[PDB]
Amino acid sequence: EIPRESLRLEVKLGQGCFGEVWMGTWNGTTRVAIKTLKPGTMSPEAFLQEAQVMKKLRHEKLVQLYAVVSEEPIYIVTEYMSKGSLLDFLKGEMGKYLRLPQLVDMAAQIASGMAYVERMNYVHRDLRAANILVGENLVCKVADFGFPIKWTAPEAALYGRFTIKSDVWSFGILLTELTTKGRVPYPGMVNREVLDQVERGYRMPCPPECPESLHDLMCQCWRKDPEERPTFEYLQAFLEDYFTSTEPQYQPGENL
């Protein structure tokens, strides 16, 4: 906890259903990002304790919590990611220029931060490009620990079975957002249509210009049986070695 007075909210970076996000300064010497919980959405004492678990986790690929203000409206001081969200990043200028190596690179970093969460016996719950923050030099970091039905695994959306293996399903979906440059999953399908199709065995096909080897990894993240989806340790390694072990004959195309 810190004196709210030492915080300064300069620019607003965006607004969400449960609060807002602001660039700003701390002690006048430190550029931070300040998240605000818009009152009445979450019981203070409640959010209070979930937050203590945000302190324990410390990784290079997890947006780092710096400080917190306990008084409503609640302030969450974290580290500033200049390039904003990955979805914004992908949908914006750079999407045109990003190719498979950059994308596969960004995926590996996320798999890295998630492999750490995996080790910590923790679960994210809401893994999607909107919750990945980008910094300088394509540094991606997992943020905002938990409706996005299209990013959610069947057993989680229906029976509330949220596990690190339901994050693996979400990751496979994230992979399509990268290969598509920010496009929405299951294009042309509304949540209910998605929910019903996936139950009957439907999975998204190979995005244009995407290699089958990369699509196969998606489908492994999309296995009906949770314990049969690979770990983030496996995905991390696979992605890091991609262009040497898996796609050494890779050649740049028009988009990928």
Partner: peptide, 4 residues
């Protein structure tokens, strides 16, 4: 969800 606090910021997208």
């Amino acid at each position: 969800x606090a910021x997208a």
